[PDB]
Design a protein around this ligand. Structure first.
Ligand SMILES: *[C@@H]1O[C@H](CO)[C@@H](O[C@@H]2O[C@H](CO)[C@@H](O[C@@H]3O[C@H](CO[C@H]4O[C@H](CO[C@H]5O[C@H](CO)[C@@H](O)[C@H](O)[C@@H]5O[C@H]5O[C@H](CO)[C@@H](O)[C@H](O)[C@@H]5O)[C@@H](O)[C@H](O[C@H]5O[C@H](CO)[C@@H](O)[C@H](O)[C@@H]5O)[C@@H]4O)[C@@H](O)[C@H](O)[C@@H]3O)[C@H](O)[C@H]2NC(C)=O)[C@H](O)[C@H]1NC(C)=O
Ligand SMILES: OC[C@H]1O[C@@H](O[C@@H]2[C@@H](O)[C@H](O[C@@H]3[C@@H](O)[C@H](O[C@@H]4[C@@H](O)[C@H](O[C@@H]5[C@@H](O)[C@H](O[C@@H]6[C@@H](O)[C@H](O[C@@H]7[C@@H](O)[C@H](O)O[C@H](CO)[C@H]7O)O[C@H](CO)[C@H]6O)O[C@H](CO)[C@H]5O)O[C@H](CO)[C@H]4O)O[C@H](CO)[C@H]3O)O[C@H](CO)[C@H]2O)[C@H](O)[C@@H](O)[C@@H]1O
Length: 298
């Protein structure tokens, strides 16, 4: 459970170690993902000092026939197998219609190379969800040691209605406006051949491991307490469902999850998601990631 620093990304480092994906949104959201040059010119990405900001356009009223709201999706150039990734996050996007995520995948063969969602949610609805999506023959036991609560236990995209196998974090400040009011926190994910684990520590936690908070060169996960989400190999050969994955951090709007009427209105958001996203630019002023660092250990 001992790992050593492999990548340390802070500030402007993200501009050379990640790319921006200017792609049609695979989740069909009301978004226009821009390239790196466009994002930097429009200040949708800001990467300087000890800060990376990734944000949505919060000024344009969209043309209903035109593209969706400008935003960004960044992807690590490097890929990882057995590793730990630690995200020191000061702020995550909020607002009705938002669907932010920090996750890992191999886009080239999805879902067969796996995806693991470390931070994800929709429409300001706490708590955070940590979820795997795989091909066939991957499920999770009903009971396993973790602080969060399992919802769906079948990870196979094809037989699970694309829900994946997910765990809900136990505290509201794991996500959304609650997380932002508290100054964010740290998310760490350990992936091995035998399991995936995710830990959340709030910014003000008296028990955050120094491993996580101070980002030294060596870490030991045996000292981190019980994970928030645990995906053991009891009913899933983890290593055979995941290959080398990139880290992705993005913000979409509406789309296949957040944009469902039942879900959007369920969250207390008014009207249709697309109409809201088109017509309320100001409401996205807080639709930004503010990331202090991302570090990977191997
Ligand atoms: C494109 O978009 C970018 C991003 O939005 C725009 O940049 C912003 O521009 C505006 C306008 O110029 C800036 O607003 C000004 O900020 C002045 C103060 O800035 C300084 O402090 C900021 C807050 O620092 C504290 O909080 C953070 C955590 O959030 C800590 O990391 C930090 O250590 C500080 O902690 C102290 O305070 C807390 C409590 O609040 C205590 O608990 C701590 O112990 C400390 O006491 C900070 O964000 C700023 O950092 C920026 O600049 C430094 C270099 O100077 C760099 O290293 C950072 O990476 C970062 O870039 C800075 O230190 C304020 O006095 C003034 O009135 C005004 O509000 C704003 O700072 C900019 N934001 C950022 C992230 O840079 C940019 O303008 C835009 N381009 C356009 C539109 O043209
Ligand atoms: O539970 C948490 C979990 O929720 C998931 O949403 C589920 C939602 O999809 C579902 O709505 C379905 C709806 O999906 C269906 O439309 C079908 C289209 O989905 C489909 O297009 C797929 C296409 O999506 C896929 O692209 C892959 C992406 O899905 C994937 O997205 C990432 C997630 O896997 C990851 O968990 O999180 C990140 C960050 O948020 C996501 O971006 O990224 C891959 C890599 O980039 C990408 O390949 O490709 C496949 C194959 O190529 C394609 O099939 O198109 C079909 C038409 O062929 C269409 O039917 O429609 C139904 C009916 O209306 C609708 O119910 O509802 C579930 C229950 O609410 C909901 O859980 C999120 O996607 C997860 O992110 C989240 O973890």
């Amino acid at each position: 459970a001992t790992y050593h620093l492999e990548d340390n990304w802070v500030g402007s480092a993200f501009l050379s170690t990640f790319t921006h994906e200017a792609i049609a949104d695979p989740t069909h959201g009301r978004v226009n993902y821009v390239d790196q040059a466009t994002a930097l010119a429009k200040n949708l990405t800001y990467a300087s000092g000890d800060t990376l900001i990734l944000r949505a356009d919060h000024t344009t009223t969209l043309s209903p026939s035109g593209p969706g709201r400008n935003s960004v999706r960044i992807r690590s150039i490097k890929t990882y197998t057995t590793h730990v990734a630690v995200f020191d996050v000061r702020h995550m996007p909020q607002g009705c219609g938002t669907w932010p995520a920090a996750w890992e995948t191999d886009e080239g063969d999805w879902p067969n190379g796996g995806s693991v969602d470390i931070i994800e949610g929709v429409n300001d609805q706490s708590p955070n969800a940590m979820t795997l999506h795989t091909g066939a023959n991957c499920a999770m036991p009903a009971s396993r040691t973790m602080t969060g609560h399992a919802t769906n236990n079948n990870c196979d995209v094809n037989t699970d209605g694309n829900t994946g196998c997910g765990v809900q974090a136990p505290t509201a400040n794991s996500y959304g406006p609650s997380f932002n009011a508290n100054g964010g926190g740290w998310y760490a994910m350990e992936r091995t051949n035998s399991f995936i684990k995710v830990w959340f520590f709030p910014r003000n936690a008296g028990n955050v491991p120094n491993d996580i908070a101070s980002g030294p060169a060596t870490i030991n996960t045996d000292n981190w307490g019980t994970p928030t989400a645990f995906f053991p190999n009891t009913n899933c050969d983890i290593g055979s469902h995941f290959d080398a994955n990139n880290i992705i951090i993005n913000l979409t709007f509406c789309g296949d999850w957040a944009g469902q009427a039942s879900i959007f209105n369920g969250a207390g958001c008014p009207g249709s998601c697309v109409d809201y996203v088109n017509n309320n630019p100001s409401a996205f002023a807080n639709a930004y990631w503010d990331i202090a660092s991302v570090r990977v250990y191997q």
